[PDB]
Design a protein around this ligand. Sequence first.
Ligand SMILES: *[C@@H]1O[C@H](CO)[C@@H](O)[C@H](O)[C@H]1NC(C)=O
Lengths: 50, 50, 50, 49
Amino acid sequence: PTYGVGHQPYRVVVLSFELLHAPATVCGPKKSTNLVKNKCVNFNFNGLTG
Amino acid sequence: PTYGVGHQPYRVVVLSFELLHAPATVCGPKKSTNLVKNKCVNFNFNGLTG
Amino acid sequence: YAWNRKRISNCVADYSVIYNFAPFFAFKCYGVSPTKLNDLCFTNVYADSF
Amino acid sequence: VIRGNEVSQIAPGQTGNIADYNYKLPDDFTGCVIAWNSNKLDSKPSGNY
Ligand SMILES: *[C@@H]1O[C@H](CO)[C@@H](O)[C@H](O)[C@H]1NC(C)=O
């Protein structure tokens, strides 16, 4: 503890995400909505918005 | 006081300046110069130079 | 107001041993990169301290 | 756990000691890094070994 501020221990946690190429396993909190067809809508499929 | 360095209180002051559209009211110590005309000069009117 | 200037010439500059000498966070450089200081090399170094 | 000088070494496209021989990140990295001080939990007056 007698060291300076440039020599203190630092705990590092690195979160590495894999982008969506496979089926999604981990996903954030969002409320699902029933599917509609043959209408111009705004879709959010697994984080892909259009 | 026993909490970590990221959970400390922080005093925040946000200074929002609104831009010059009205007559200017609040600004600092720049010494004014007498106005001369009919000559190519460098003018500084309320902060805008030319 | 009376900062000290030192000339560094005719030696072999190891910049990887600066870090364990003073407790500073960032080796803030402008025209070069701190990790690439050994591959490229210079003519003269001037060190100013205040 | 690293020291304070090498926190800037955990970044894509870096060289040194941690980024060359200990922990290397890819150039196409998509993710976050969280580093915080541990002067109380990971430090001893006699020296942490
Ligand atoms: C600071 O420089 C002195 C020069 O005599 C040296 O003895 C000492 O080891 C240096 N400090 C560190 C932390 O290397």
